[PDB]
Enzyme design. Structure first.
Site, PDB file in Angstrom:
ATOM      1  N   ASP A 149       0.921  -1.147   0.000  1.00  0.00           N
ATOM      2  CA  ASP A 149       0.000   0.000   0.000  1.00  0.00           C
ATOM      3  C   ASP A 149       0.955   1.189   0.000  1.00  0.00           C
ATOM      4  O   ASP A 149       1.640   1.411   0.999  1.00  0.00           O
ATOM      5  CB  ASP A 149      -0.892  -0.024   1.259  1.00  0.00           C
ATOM      6  CG  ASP A 149      -1.638   1.267   1.552  1.00  0.00           C
ATOM      7  OD1 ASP A 149      -1.635   2.179   0.681  1.00  0.00           O
ATOM      8  OD2 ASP A 149      -2.217   1.374   2.645  1.00  0.00           O
ATOM      9  N   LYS A 151       2.815  11.562  -3.378  1.00  0.00           N
ATOM     10  CA  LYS A 151       1.644  10.942  -4.027  1.00  0.00           C
ATOM     11  C   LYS A 151       0.666  12.009  -4.544  1.00  0.00           C
ATOM     12  O   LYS A 151      -0.076  11.762  -5.497  1.00  0.00           O
ATOM     13  CB  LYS A 151       0.946  10.016  -3.019  1.00  0.00           C
ATOM     14  CG  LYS A 151      -0.182   9.191  -3.640  1.00  0.00           C
ATOM     15  CD  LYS A 151      -0.536   8.043  -2.732  1.00  0.00           C
ATOM     16  CE  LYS A 151      -1.762   7.375  -3.233  1.00  0.00           C
ATOM     17  NZ  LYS A 151      -2.164   6.285  -2.312  1.00  0.00           N
ATOM     18  N   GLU A 160      -7.127   0.841  -4.355  1.00  0.00           N
ATOM     19  CA  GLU A 160      -7.140   0.712  -2.891  1.00  0.00           C
ATOM     20  C   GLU A 160      -8.487   0.158  -2.384  1.00  0.00           C
ATOM     21  O   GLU A 160      -8.439  -0.818  -1.626  1.00  0.00           O
ATOM     22  CB  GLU A 160      -6.838   2.075  -2.232  1.00  0.00           C
ATOM     23  CG  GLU A 160      -5.355   2.432  -2.317  1.00  0.00           C
ATOM     24  CD  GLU A 160      -5.052   3.914  -2.225  1.00  0.00           C
ATOM     25  OE1 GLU A 160      -5.892   4.669  -1.691  1.00  0.00           O
ATOM     26  OE2 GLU A 160      -3.967   4.321  -2.692  1.00  0.00           O
ATOM     27  N   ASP A 182     -12.925   5.319   3.718  1.00  0.00           N
ATOM     28  CA  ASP A 182     -11.500   5.528   3.894  1.00  0.00           C
ATOM     29  C   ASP A 182     -11.154   6.904   4.436  1.00  0.00           C
ATOM     30  O   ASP A 182     -11.122   7.882   3.681  1.00  0.00           O
ATOM     31  CB  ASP A 182     -10.804   5.279   2.553  1.00  0.00           C
ATOM     32  CG  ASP A 182      -9.295   5.121   2.629  1.00  0.00           C
ATOM     33  OD1 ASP A 182      -8.695   5.574   3.636  1.00  0.00           O
ATOM     34  OD2 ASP A 182      -8.714   4.551   1.682  1.00  0.00           O
TER      35      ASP A 182
HETATM   36 MG   LIG Z   1      -4.770   4.601   2.380  1.00  0.00          MG
END
Ligand SMILES: [Mg+2]
Ligand SMILES: Nc1ncnc2c1nc(Br)n2[C@@H]1O[C@H](CO)[C@@H](O)[C@H]1O
Length: 390
Positions: free
Chosen positions: A12, A73, A177, A201
């Site tokens: 991840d 990211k 994800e 999330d």
């Molecule tokens: Mg995450």
């Protein structure tokens, strides 16, 4: 005959933290790094003598803010002119430069000014995750599944593969994800018939809601929604402002201009925030916080809940929006999955469970580990090379 194959890993590659797992002996092992941490900061720091990655980079950030890179990211696969990039740059202490409308992070490193593409910084984080896995397995690792947000476009996905290739990894697949979190719970192994899954999330800085439909192990992304301005750091900020006010009332002193005092306060606030997820109250004890004054206090879970009440409630707006976009009613959702450390907050869990009329939340896999867990499950599946019997 045929030499045993090395295990493949699931990574991840997170905005704030990254996580690595391996599927062996019919189960996933989330691998701790050599400081004992099951998640590793997605940070890279540069000095005159070293390049530090993970905990070592995050632990020296206070005095080296210009040369400690985080949040790459948010830049990966984006143009320098992208309005997301232009806004984010105002919050970062490190320099972001324009190289042919492609952002690069510019730092002082080993006696020189050096600029890196976001994929190069991410390859450094991936190199650390590969080494963490190799320290546990006791052999070199080649194959990996890397996850990305469901909303990542082709350029963002290709730049993530490029980061894996720079790190010396063979990227088996780039997977979403929310799909990986669903795979972690075996939600693609329930047989024939459609299942609607909502992934909730809540990260350090952003909030993502995804609705997936799973039919015979096939995933379809039905809707994505979220809040780019909602995360764990906003709850820490509410605690910071509260305790700054408390110090003013109690000692008639404003600490807000001593960066060290504010930073020590924020660090203590984040730990008190974590304690409040398991206990109904938490102490806060800082020695010589400001002008040699010891700051020994406490906060109840009820007061913390009141301080962040509006922020916690706002997680339900993207849930309702995602449901309208998927053209689904809340009762039609079969499974609810929690992702992100901030989902351990009891009030966040209660608000969402109440919204879904008392339904159970899948939270048995550590929410900060579920994405890597699912990625590790998929990595083991992808390297199988079984030849059919007659
Ligand atoms: Mg995450
Ligand atoms: N037990 C926990 N209860 C509340 N929050 C938590 C917990 N564990 C983690 Br991890 N967090 C927060 O998750 C985010 C990950 O970037 C950060 O904001 C962490 O503070």
């Amino acid at each position: 005959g045929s030499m045993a194959k090395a295990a493949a890993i699931g990574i991840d590659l997170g905005t704030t933290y990254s996580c690595v797992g391996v599927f062996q002996h019919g189960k996933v092992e989330i691998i701790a790094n050599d400081q004992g941490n099951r998640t590793t900061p997605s940070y890279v720091a540069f000095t005159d003598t070293e390049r530090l990655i993970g905990d070592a980079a995050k632990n020296q950030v206070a005095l080296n803010p210009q040369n400690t890179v985080f949040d790459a990211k948010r830049l990966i696969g984006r143009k320098f002119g992208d309005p997301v990039v232009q806004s984010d740059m105002k919050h970062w202490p490190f320099q972001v430069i324009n190289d042919g409308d492609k952002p690069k992070v510019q730092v002082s490193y080993k006696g020189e000014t050096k600029a890196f593409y976001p994929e190069e910084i991410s390859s450094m984080v991936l190199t650390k995750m590969k080494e963490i896995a190799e320290a546990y397995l006791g052999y070199p690792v080649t194959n990996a599944v890397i996850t990305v947000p469901a909303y990542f476009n082709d350029s963002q996905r290709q730049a993530t593969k490029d980061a894996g290739v720079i790190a010396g990894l063979n990227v088996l697949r780039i997977i979403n994800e929310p799909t990986a979190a669903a795979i972690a719970y075996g939600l693609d192994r329930t047989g024939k018939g459609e299942r609607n899954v909502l992934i909730f999330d809540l990260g350090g800085g952003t909030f993502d809601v995804s609705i997936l439909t799973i039919d015979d192990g096939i995933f379809e992304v039905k809707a994505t929604a979220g809040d780019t301005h909602l995360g764990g750091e906003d709850f820490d900020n509410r605690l910071v402002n509260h305790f700054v006010e408390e110090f003013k009332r109690k000692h008639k002193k404003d600490i807000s201009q001593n960066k060290r005092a504010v930073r020590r306060l924020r660090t203590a606030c984040e730990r008190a925030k974590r304690t409040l997820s398991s206990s109904t109250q938490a102490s806060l004890e800082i020695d010589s916080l400001f002008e040699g004054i010891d700051f020994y206090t406490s906060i109840t879970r009820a007061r913390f809940e009141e301080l962040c009440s509006d922020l916690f409630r706002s997680t339900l707006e993207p849930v309702e929006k995602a449901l309208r976009d998927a053209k689904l009613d809340k009762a039609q959702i079969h499974d609810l999955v929690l992702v992100g450390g901030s989902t351990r907050i009891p009030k966040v869990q209660k608000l969402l469970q109440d919204f879904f009329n008392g339904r159970d939340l899948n939270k048995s896999i550590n929410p900060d580990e579920a994405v890597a867990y699912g990625a590790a499950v998929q990595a083991a599946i992808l390297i199988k090379s079984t030849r059919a019997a007659a």
